[PDB]
Amino acid sequence: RDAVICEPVRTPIGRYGGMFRSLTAVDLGVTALKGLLERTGIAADQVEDVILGHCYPNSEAPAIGRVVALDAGLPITVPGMQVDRRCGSGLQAVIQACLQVRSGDHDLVVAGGAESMSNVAFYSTDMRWGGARTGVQIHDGLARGRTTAGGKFHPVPGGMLETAENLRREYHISRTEQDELAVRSHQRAVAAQSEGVLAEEIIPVPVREETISVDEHPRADTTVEALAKLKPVLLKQDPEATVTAGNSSGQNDAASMCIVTTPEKAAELGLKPLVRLVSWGSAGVAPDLMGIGPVPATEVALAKAGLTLADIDLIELNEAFAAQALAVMREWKFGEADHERTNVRGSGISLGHPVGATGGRMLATLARELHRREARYGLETMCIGGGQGLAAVFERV
Amino acid sequence: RDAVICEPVRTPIGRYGGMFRSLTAVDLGVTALKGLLERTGIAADQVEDVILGHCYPNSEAPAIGRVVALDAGLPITVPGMQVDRRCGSGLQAVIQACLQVRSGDHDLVVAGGAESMSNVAFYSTDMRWGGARTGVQIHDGLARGRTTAGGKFHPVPGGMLETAENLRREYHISRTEQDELAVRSHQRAVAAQSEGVLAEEIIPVPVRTEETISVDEHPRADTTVEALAKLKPVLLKQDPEATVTAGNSSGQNDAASMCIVTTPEKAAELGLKPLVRLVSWGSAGVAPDLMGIGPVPATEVALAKAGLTLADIDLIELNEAFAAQALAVMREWKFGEADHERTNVRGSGISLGHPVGATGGRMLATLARELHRREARYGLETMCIGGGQGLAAVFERV
Amino acid sequence: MRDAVICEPVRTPIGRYGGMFRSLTAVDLGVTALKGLLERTGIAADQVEDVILGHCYPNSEAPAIGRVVALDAGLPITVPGMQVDRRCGSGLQAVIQACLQVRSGDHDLVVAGGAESMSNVAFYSTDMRWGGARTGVQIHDGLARGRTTAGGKFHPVPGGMLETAENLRREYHISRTEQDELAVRSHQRAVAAQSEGVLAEEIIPVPVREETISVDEHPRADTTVEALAKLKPVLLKQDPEATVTAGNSSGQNDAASMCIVTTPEKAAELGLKPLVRLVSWGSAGVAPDLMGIGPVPATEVALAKAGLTLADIDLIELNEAFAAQALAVMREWKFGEADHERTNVRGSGISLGHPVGATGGRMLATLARELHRREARYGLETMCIGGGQGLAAVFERV
Amino acid sequence: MRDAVICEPVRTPIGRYGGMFRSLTAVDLGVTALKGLLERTGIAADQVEDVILGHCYPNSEAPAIGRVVALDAGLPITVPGMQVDRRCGSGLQAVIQACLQVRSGDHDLVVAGGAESMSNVAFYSTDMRWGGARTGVQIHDGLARGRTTAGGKFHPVPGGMLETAENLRREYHISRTEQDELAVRSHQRAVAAQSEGVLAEEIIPVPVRTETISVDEHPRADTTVEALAKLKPVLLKQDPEATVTAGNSSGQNDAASMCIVTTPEKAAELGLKPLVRLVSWGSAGVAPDLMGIGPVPATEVALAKAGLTLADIDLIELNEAFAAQALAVMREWKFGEADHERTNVRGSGISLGHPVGATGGRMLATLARELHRREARYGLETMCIGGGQGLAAVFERV
Numbered sequence A: 001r002d003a004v005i006c007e008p009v010r011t012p013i014g015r016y017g018g019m020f021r022s023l024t025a026v027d028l029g030v031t032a033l034k035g036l037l038e039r040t041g042i043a044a045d046q047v048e049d050v051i052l053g054h055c056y057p058n059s060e061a062p063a064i065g066r067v068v069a070l071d072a073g074l075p076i077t078v079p080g081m082q083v084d085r086r087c088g089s090g091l092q093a094v095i096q097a098c099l100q101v102r103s104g105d106h107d108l109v110v111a112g113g114a115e116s117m118s119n120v121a122f123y124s125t126d127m128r129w130g131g132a133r134t135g136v137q138i139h140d141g142l143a144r145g146r147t148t149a150g151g152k153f154h155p156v157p158g159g160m161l162e163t164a165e166n167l168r169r170e171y172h173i174s175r176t177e178q179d180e181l182a183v184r185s186h187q188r189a190v191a192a193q194s195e196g197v198l199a200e201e202i203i204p205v206p207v208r209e210e211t212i213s214v215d216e217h218p219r220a221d222t223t224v225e226a227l228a229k230l231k232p233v234l235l236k237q238d239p240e241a242t243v244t245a246g247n248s249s250g251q252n253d254a255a256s257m258c259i260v261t262t263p264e265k266a267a268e269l270g271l272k273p274l275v276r277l278v279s280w281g282s283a284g285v286a287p288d289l290m291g292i293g294p295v296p297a298t299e300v301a302l303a304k305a306g307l308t309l310a311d312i313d314l315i316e317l318n319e320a321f322a323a324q325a326l327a328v329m330r331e332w333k334f335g336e337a338d339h340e341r342t343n344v345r346g347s348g349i350s351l352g353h354p355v356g357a358t359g360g361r362m363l364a365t366l367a368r369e370l371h372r373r374e375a376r377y378g379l380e381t382m383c384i385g386g387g388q389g390l391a392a393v394f395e396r397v
Numbered sequence B: 001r002d003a004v005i006c007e008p009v010r011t012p013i014g015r016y017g018g019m020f021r022s023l024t025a026v027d028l029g030v031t032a033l034k035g036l037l038e039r040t041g042i043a044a045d046q047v048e049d050v051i052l053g054h055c056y057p058n059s060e061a062p063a064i065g066r067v068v069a070l071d072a073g074l075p076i077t078v079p080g081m082q083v084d085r086r087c088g089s090g091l092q093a094v095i096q097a098c099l100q101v102r103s104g105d106h107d108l109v110v111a112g113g114a115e116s117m118s119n120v121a122f123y124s125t126d127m128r129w130g131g132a133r134t135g136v137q138i139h140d141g142l143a144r145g146r147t148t149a150g151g152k153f154h155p156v157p158g159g160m161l162e163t164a165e166n167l168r169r170e171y172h173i174s175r176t177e178q179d180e181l182a183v184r185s186h187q188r189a190v191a192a193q194s195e196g197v198l199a200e201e202i203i204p205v206p207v208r209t210e211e212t213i214s215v216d217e218h219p220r221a222d223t224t225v226e227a228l229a230k231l232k233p234v235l236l237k238q239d240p241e242a243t244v245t246a247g248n249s250s251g252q253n254d255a256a257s258m259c260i261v262t263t264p265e266k267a268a269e270l271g272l273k274p275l276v277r278l279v280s281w282g283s284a285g286v287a288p289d290l291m292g293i294g295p296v297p298a299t300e301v302a303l304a305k306a307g308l309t310l311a312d313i314d315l316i317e318l319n320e321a322f323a324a325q326a327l328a329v330m331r332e333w334k335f336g337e338a339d340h341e342r343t344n345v346r347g348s349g350i351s352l353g354h355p356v357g358a359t360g361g362r363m364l365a366t367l368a369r370e371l372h373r374r375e376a377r378y379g380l381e382t383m384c385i386g387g388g389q390g391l392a393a394v395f396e397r398v
Numbered sequence C: 001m002r003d004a005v006i007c008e009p010v011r012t013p014i015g016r017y018g019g020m021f022r023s024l025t026a027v028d029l030g031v032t033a034l035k036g037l038l039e040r041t042g043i044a045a046d047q048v049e050d051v052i053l054g055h056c057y058p059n060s061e062a063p064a065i066g067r068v069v070a071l072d073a074g075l076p077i078t079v080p081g082m083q084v085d086r087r088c089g090s091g092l093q094a095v096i097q098a099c100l101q102v103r104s105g106d107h108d109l110v111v112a113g114g115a116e117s118m119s120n121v122a123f124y125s126t127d128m129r130w131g132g133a134r135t136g137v138q139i140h141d142g143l144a145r146g147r148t149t150a151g152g153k154f155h156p157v158p159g160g161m162l163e164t165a166e167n168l169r170r171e172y173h174i175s176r177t178e179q180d181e182l183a184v185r186s187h188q189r190a191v192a193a194q195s196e197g198v199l200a201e202e203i204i205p206v207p208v209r210e211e212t213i214s215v216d217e218h219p220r221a222d223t224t225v226e227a228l229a230k231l232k233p234v235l236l237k238q239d240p241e242a243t244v245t246a247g248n249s250s251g252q253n254d255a256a257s258m259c260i261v262t263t264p265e266k267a268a269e270l271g272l273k274p275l276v277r278l279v280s281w282g283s284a285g286v287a288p289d290l291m292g293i294g295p296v297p298a299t300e301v302a303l304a305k306a307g308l309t310l311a312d313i314d315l316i317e318l319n320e321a322f323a324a325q326a327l328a329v330m331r332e333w334k335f336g337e338a339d340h341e342r343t344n345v346r347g348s349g350i351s352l353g354h355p356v357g358a359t360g361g362r363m364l365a366t367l368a369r370e371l372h373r374r375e376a377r378y379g380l381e382t383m384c385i386g387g388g389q390g391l392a393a394v395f396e397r398v
Numbered sequence D: 001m002r003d004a005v006i007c008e009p010v011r012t013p014i015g016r017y018g019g020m021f022r023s024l025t026a027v028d029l030g031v032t033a034l035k036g037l038l039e040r041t042g043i044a045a046d047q048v049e050d051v052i053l054g055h056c057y058p059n060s061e062a063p064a065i066g067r068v069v070a071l072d073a074g075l076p077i078t079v080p081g082m083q084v085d086r087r088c089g090s091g092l093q094a095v096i097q098a099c100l101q102v103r104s105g106d107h108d109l110v111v112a113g114g115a116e117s118m119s120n121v122a123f124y125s126t127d128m129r130w131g132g133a134r135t136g137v138q139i140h141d142g143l144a145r146g147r148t149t150a151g152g153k154f155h156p157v158p159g160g161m162l163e164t165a166e167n168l169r170r171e172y173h174i175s176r177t178e179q180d181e182l183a184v185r186s187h188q189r190a191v192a193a194q195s196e197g198v199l200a201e202e203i204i205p206v207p208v209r210t211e212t213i214s215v216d217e218h219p220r221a222d223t224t225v226e227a228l229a230k231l232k233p234v235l236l237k238q239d240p241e242a243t244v245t246a247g248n249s250s251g252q253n254d255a256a257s258m259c260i261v262t263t264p265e266k267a268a269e270l271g272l273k274p275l276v277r278l279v280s281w282g283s284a285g286v287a288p289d290l291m292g293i294g295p296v297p298a299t300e301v302a303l304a305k306a307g308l309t310l311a312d313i314d315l316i317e318l319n320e321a322f323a324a325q326a327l328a329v330m331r332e333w334k335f336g337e338a339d340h341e342r343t344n345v346r347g348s349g350i351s352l353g354h355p356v357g358a359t360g361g362r363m364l365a366t367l368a369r370e371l372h373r374r375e376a377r378y379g380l381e382t383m384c385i386g387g388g389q390g391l392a393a394v395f396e397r398v
């Protein structure tokens, strides 16, 4: 049977240390989930699982989907869990939810994600048995995880930015090419804001009191010349570095939720199914070239769906970094026109990259922009730390 | 198409701060995975995904399945990921493996779990912005996580054990019977050791001294009801009628479980020996203060979908999180004495240990291998889940 | 048996907690005050026989910090130095120590001083060397933690210093209005002293990267009784009648203090101009939860030693650890509204701040300088001390 | 003015770092030693007027530690106390301070001592107060970190005090054997003193949980040049010609020392037996990288003040932080093999350990008591000081 996506929503995306620095991952997740049940008006015991992507879990919220479920007031009968495939986690939680709906096990599930990167822990694996001999280390959960993701034989000291410079260097991507993508990314998001199509995805959030409904990172005044004045983060290590804060996705706080269900049950509950899952694909690449993950994964998803990238009307590619994104679009042999059907309400550079919540944000816009365009096929894909890719093909209902 | 389970193996299980204490969660999973491929002889490019249950992740190993894959020397073409549903995470990882294999998306994946409770980090949410005004609290991941799993509206200061006491209380469960179970638990494990059946199950783990360890660290031959009665209930100081001790509780432990999830065709094509196939599974939400009873609704869901009853099930694995917890489920299953002879035949949580993430894969290793050994048909694996859940799968022999 | 006289007592400005000197260390600040003291006086660095520094939150960044400040300020390697701790009374303790060492003949000229960077005081743990497996791990704020442990296992004070302030508030029936009035008056005197130009006489301007700072950051031109009334007591939750706030407490701050201690003969030999001499000093112990009354017996000891009474005393620096604390002390002294006219005349801990190690030398700089402008005779410096102590000293104008 | 005599100088046994007193804090040790001293002297607790303790790794578990040891030992709340640090000379410094303020007529009886738990020195961070997102967060071992900071930023020494020992080995052309011979001799005197029952008057035995300990952990009767010859010089990777090993180095250790400082009259009135009086003392600064030669200029200062020469000293205590270091001092002292028999007759830093803050009162224990046992006249106590200082006292038999 088919699994359709209904009402994919998200909180606004906050900056790192910004408007949402007060709220936990659970706080953001609860808000998106209650917001979701509010719009759909569906009984809480219609929900058979809350599966969330969450890339920096800690014991503040074990098996977070169940915690977000209980903290949103859902009955104790609603199960929940946590998944982590880095950047892809949110799509992973949607694909899993589709698998257990299409298989007949479940009729309705919540698939989503929650990340508060402002509150990702520092931690130590040296404090339990003694730091006498070894010394004690305390790691920044964000930084550390970005050098360790490829395992001990595959380290990347400079993390995700080092990988983005790897691609820049491999693919001869100019610094101007990267700042150009960055500015245009901001335009789309600012345009989408003013057009009012973002109120359709966004579950506003109350903070200690004010209620925020706009995203924190997109800037109206962003320009190419302005971006030119920024320092490439790894410029010391690399005279030919290009990747800066301006052409990189930021760190951010958000949550994302959607209903995954069947057409019959959606009809029964008065829901409006936007898209259905067609195919998906997962790929592994070299950790130091992670950014090219979207190419082998997209291949597999398209192949499964018997389509070509030519058959795809709309694309969500996350853009962890301009350089990375440009490397994927180069493989895809893209023209200027293709740019007009890719990330048309923004991307990670302009909207931010609240990692576990990013998969569900691309889904919100992809699903929604498809119905308003009355287009047919949609592709969602993302590079993944440690060297993976993930792509799903969605079809409008 | 079916999803079948091949060569499910595990490490030995070390105690907390014990023999595998210098070994990380990745170390243990790499050993287990490397052992799986060595026995099965499959080319490493045949693996399409490594899905691991892993309950105290940190940035020493993000999306851990991927890291285990790489550190085992698997092609960088092999994806992997990490799942958390507390105790039920090793089976969760299996079920997910079955779903994406039965769906036709994949022909072969690895499902397992990995836990080093010995090396679970200490963490703080106060260092990023500074403790100038608030101070800096550092939490024990193990200790903190027993409080939080039910959220802010369903508080449990004493965690899973406090809920194990609640079951003793609501179910009228005596310490004697609790300790009688633990005793039974050790000599089924200790039996199963001398009978040499753990041999098929276990990937011997080499440690620098260099020795190879191949026997589980917690089982004890000299366990008796009398010796256990001497044990102080952990929550005695708050509770007069308290019964739950270290002796009828599962410990904190270090291990990894690995398993091949594929189709009957692919396994024939690779010379594999499928043991069980997935018949059904179920998940259930219960009260966070009474988590222990989670297997009961979950099992009925799994049984319902299968078209079976608990009579149809010949072999049972229940993780014995606590004796009281386990007895309460068996009391709900209206269990008798002969029912015990089909339940937990190589030991369980109290004797073998409970390395949370790897537990669903130990139970699977036993269920599948013992079903085959006895030429029994149906097996049931089920487990209570911190926070108040239950998961259960029904497996059928091939 | 010679006299001990004090020459050119100076200090840095006093920065706010997390304020204008946050990127500077206890040593940086001490190096500035010392270089300024040598630069004004012109004393040859190899005339300095010891650099004795009161310093309340030492760590291994700067061991025996008087030595480190001496070295980092460019003094020869022949100049010895050390660190002393008696909490708030450390800066005075270091002067009293210098006086003893000079009156005896062992030395002729030393530097006595203090240095605190509360902005940069460490967080620490005594659980991580051998592990928190069995105990758990704490990370302690050296500020907050030191304030509850100061009185030992038999006299713990969970609410720290603020708690002791409240205790003095209750015992002496001290109103919020009163404490807020003292504080307002404290800022007034500081802000005026500043406007009148007298504070620049004490101050060594500090280079901070790039500018030069020469003005105390903590005082406020705009303090009112009405503004103060708005503030919520730190301990209001614990105690409905709590009165101690941010506004009527001393601040946590960054500064350093230094002065020459030498003999009359020696000052004369180098053509230095002594400001005051040590008449007497006393120290005393009180209940740790009543430390704040420490100055009362310490003063009585110092007076009796000196054959004086508080009526012989033209000027008083009594550190305002807390308005509730300063008011209690004066109550034991039975103070007039007129008596405030001779007490803390350019401000104190509440308005200028309380860089704990350095505060003793701040009070001395004021006291000694202001004894000359009024052409008074006797001055008293005294301080309550966490853990329940007091220190007092009588200085006489030369 | 009046004289100052040292009564009943005692210590705890000295424990190895991570050794027998690992479980005890510096306060635990300071209390043990202070109670010992109080019970042995029968003095009334309210007769102590100040507890001045050398303490070289203070943290907020025990602020102004003299007062915490005072209160936790059961002294009245009326007894003041403090902490001093001049690194390795810290415990002598406390004696000298106590002396100054008895001779001044200020106090009639104070306690001077030192206390170190190097087993439990804290881990600390300057990176947790204002946040670590842009810098990261580091946490330092207080011991390891102190190895490089004592000399400030203009006189770096990467390998700390050990490197310093190598520098004195290099410049004085001191052989590995000569070094190791001293170590052996250090150990024989230690063990010999145990057998002769002479230590039983220095030592206050220390109860530890699950028994009473009375004997130092580090001496070993079996020490030989041969055994020592096998050890690898700590810094051989950098220096092909290194000599300094764990065997001819002084160690990291745990102990407290206490003694009484009073007048001759007060002693008599209280039944005390005055052992010695402090003739004079001297301090000095030397180049940080030539740290261990500190005792050479400080001894000459102290001897000069006393009107004595090094010939006039019957007993020398020299803390031997390293063999190479001690020997360089002895060389400058023009020692002959006969001079070795009046120097450190019960062991030294190498055989008993170097519990930094308590070393001073250990040397003082042995020096006072061996001057009475030998019917001699003048003792010299001197030690080098990390950071590049020297400190010495000359005492006289009463």
Ligand SMILES: CC(C)(COP(=O)(O)OP(=O)(O)OC[C@H]1O[C@@H](n2cnc3c(N)ncnc32)[C@H](O)[C@@H]1OP(=O)(O)O)[C@@H](O)C(=O)NCCC(=O)NCCS
Pocket: A087, A159, A160, A161, A222, A223, A226, A227, A229, A230, A233, A244, A245, A246, A248, A249, A250, A251, A320, A353, A384, A385
């Ligand atoms: C983007 C990132 C590099 C930023 O790091 P950062 O140093 O915190 O950067 P900031 O946002 O503080 O920006 C630095 C400055 O650039 C400024 N800036 C941004 N756009 C600008 C423009 N057009 N002109 C001028 N300045 C600009 C910011 O305002 C900021 O200004 P300030 O320093 O004056 O306040 C980092 O957040 C990041 O990308 N990491 C997460 C993503 C990642 O590593 N990988 C995950 C994907 S796999």
Ligand SMILES: CC(C)(COP(=O)(O)OP(=O)(O)OC[C@H]1O[C@@H](n2cnc3c(N)ncnc32)[C@H](O)[C@@H]1OP(=O)(O)O)[C@@H](O)C(=O)NCCC(=O)NCCS
Pocket: B133, C017, C088, C161, C162, C183, C220, C223, C224, C227, C228, C231, C234, C245, C246, C247, C248, C249, C250, C251, C252, C321, C322, C354, C356, C384, C385, C386
């Ligand atoms: C009292 C104490 C807890 C203050 O906490 P803090 O929040 O870090 O200090 P702050 O400077 O931020 O003051 C807090 C608030 O009170 C306000 N405030 C302080 N003094 C004020 C005054 N005279 N008038 C009006 N408002 C004032 C501040 O503006 C601030 O408000 P804000 O948050 O809106 O900016 C801390 O300074 C303390 O412990 N002091 C005692 C130090 C001590 O024990 N010394 C040893 C003596 S034994």
